[PDB]
Design a protein around this ligand. Structure first.
Ligand SMILES: N=C(N)N[C@H]1CCCCNC(=O)[C@H](CCCCN)NC(=O)[C@H](CCCCN)NC(=O)Cc2ccc(cc2)CNC(=O)CCCNC1=O
Lengths: 155, 38
């Protein structure tokens, strides 16, 4: 299956079948976060997806081709996390991003807490475009999680 | 061996629940891809 959409990343190296993360299929390329697969090969039914591009610092990796997702937080609008938690159905959560302010510029960030196996879930803008992936962030004073809206560079 | 299985379309949900705040944090990104608060 290479149909566009959101996919679970599953392993059987552990007890039962474990969801280690999430990814986005678009234009025949599978996109997820580096820490989900660590650049490892993936299986899709009878076929095999091998890595094409990856960067630990960005924490992203692409399969079967180059990074295809190039939309970005418009700055102003609220967004939606299409969360795919392990063993639970895909669910849209609407939120207004906060901001990670770095020495290299500002990145949107979403203050939503989901299990680790939700890493790779797409964040979308109102027009349905994926503006980044969830699951790389910080834990702040209160102890809850804030994830960067992590996006790659197209072409 | 990891495998993938489809979980849905990529679509905006008009009837989505809305939660989460919008914090502004000053963070550093290290060479290992990890964010840290400053
Ligand atoms: N609520 C959370 N904190 N996490 C969520 C899942 C976060 C989203 C998934 N994405 C990651 O797991 C990435 C994977 C590394 C990316 C590679 N670069 N990790 C991170 O973004 C940050 C980065 C650290 C920055 C500080 N230098 N690491 C942590 O938060 C570790 C952690 C500290 C404390 C806890 C659980 C995990 C306490 N448990 C809970 O509260 C509930 C238990 C279940 N829910 C969770 O586990």
């Amino acid at each position: 299956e290479t149909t566009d959409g959101v996919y679970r990343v599953m392993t059987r190296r552990l007890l039962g079948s474990t969801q280690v993360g999430v990814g986005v299929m678009q234009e025949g390329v599978f996109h997820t976060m580096w820490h989900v697969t660590k650049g490892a090969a993936l299986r899709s039914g009878e076929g095999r997806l091998d890595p094409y591009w990856g960067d630990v610092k960005q924490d992203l990796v692409s399969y079967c081709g180059p990074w295809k997702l190039d939309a970005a937080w418009d700055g102003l609008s609220e967004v939606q996390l299409l969360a795919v938690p392990p063993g639970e159905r895909a669910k849209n959560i609407q939120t207004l991003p906060g901001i990670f302010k770095t020495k290299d510029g500002d990145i949107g960030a979403v203050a939503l807490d989901y299990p680790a196996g939700t890493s790779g879930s797409p964040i979308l803008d109102k027009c349905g475009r994926v503006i980044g992936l969830y699951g790389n962030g910080v834990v702040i004073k209160n102890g809850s999680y804030v994830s960067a809206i992590t996006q790659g560079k197209r072409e | 061996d990891m495998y993938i299985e489809r979980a849905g379309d990529i679509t905006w949900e008009k009837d989505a629940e809305v939660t989460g705040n919008s914090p502004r944090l000053d963070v550093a990104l290290d060479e290992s891809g990890d964010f840290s608060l400053v």
